[PDB]
Write an enzyme that holds these catalytic residues in place. Sequence first.
Site, PDB file in Angstrom:
ATOM      1  N   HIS A  26      24.915 -67.407   0.038  1.00  0.00           N
ATOM      2  CA  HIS A  26      25.672 -68.705   0.570  1.00  0.00           C
ATOM      3  C   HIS A  26      25.323 -68.820   1.944  1.00  0.00           C
ATOM      4  CE1 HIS A  26      28.562 -69.082  -2.876  1.00  0.00           C
ATOM      5  NE2 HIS A  26      27.382 -69.285  -3.576  1.00  0.00           N
TER       6      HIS A  26
ATOM      7  N   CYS B  39      25.318 -66.324   8.444  1.00  0.00           N
ATOM      8  CA  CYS B  39      25.390 -66.378   9.838  1.00  0.00           C
ATOM      9  C   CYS B  39      23.907 -66.886  10.362  1.00  0.00           C
ATOM     10  CB  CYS B  39      25.913 -65.310  10.734  1.00  0.00           C
ATOM     11  SG  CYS B  39      25.047 -63.593  10.301  1.00  0.00           S
TER      12      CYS B  39
ATOM     13  N   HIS C 137      25.745 -60.461  13.973  1.00  0.00           N
ATOM     14  CA  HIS C 137      26.455 -61.781  13.956  1.00  0.00           C
ATOM     15  C   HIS C 137      25.499 -62.539  14.747  1.00  0.00           C
ATOM     16  CE1 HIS C 137      28.926 -65.220  13.021  1.00  0.00           C
ATOM     17  NE2 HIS C 137      29.170 -65.297  14.331  1.00  0.00           N
TER      18      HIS C 137
ATOM     19  N   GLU D  90      29.234 -71.042  14.772  1.00  0.00           N
ATOM     20  CA  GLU D  90      28.762 -70.196  13.850  1.00  0.00           C
ATOM     21  C   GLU D  90      28.885 -70.368  12.426  1.00  0.00           C
ATOM     22  OE1 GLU D  90      30.915 -66.710  15.485  1.00  0.00           O
ATOM     23  OE2 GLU D  90      32.753 -67.735  14.859  1.00  0.00           O
TER      24      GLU D  90
HETATM   25 CA   LIG Z   1      21.954 -68.028   2.442  1.00  0.00          CA
END
Ligand SMILES: [Ca+2]
EC number: 3.4.22.-
Length: 164
Positions: free
Chosen positions: A51, A54, A117, A134
């Site tokens: 999905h 970052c 991140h 972000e």
């Molecule tokens: Ca992805």
Amino acid sequence: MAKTQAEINKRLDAYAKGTVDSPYRIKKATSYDPSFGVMEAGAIDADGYYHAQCQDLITDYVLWLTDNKVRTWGNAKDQIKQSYGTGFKIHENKPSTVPKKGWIAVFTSGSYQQWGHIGIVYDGGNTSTFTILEQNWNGYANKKPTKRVDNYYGLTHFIEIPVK
Ligand SMILES: [Ca+2]
């Protein structure tokens, strides 16, 4: 193929509003991996896996900054281990380092994920805090790019981008 600050600022606003011009922007609420949250309209899923992570925002960003000529590899911490091309500069974050809007912030220390991140500097701010845009700070990979005020915790590097 450098972009203007106005084009950059407009791109960062479209991300945050969920209206960015990208083929990787989620138009309607979507899920394909139940281990993550239903991705909302506005979310950026650049690889189609896990999905809206970052890094997905950064690979779509770098893609647009370079007219689809540079595709990113790896995760967040891998981004300081590759090149985006001419105009891009990697800076170490030290107490006196204040970033500029459109810059990329890299988090490779502290209690962050081991793979890091990453996000885009929306407001350069100051020495104490700045604003980031972000994805996946919740760890659930469902929300579109969201603004957060960061305090340079775990932030080790900034990547400067080319501006006209
Ligand atoms: Ca992805």
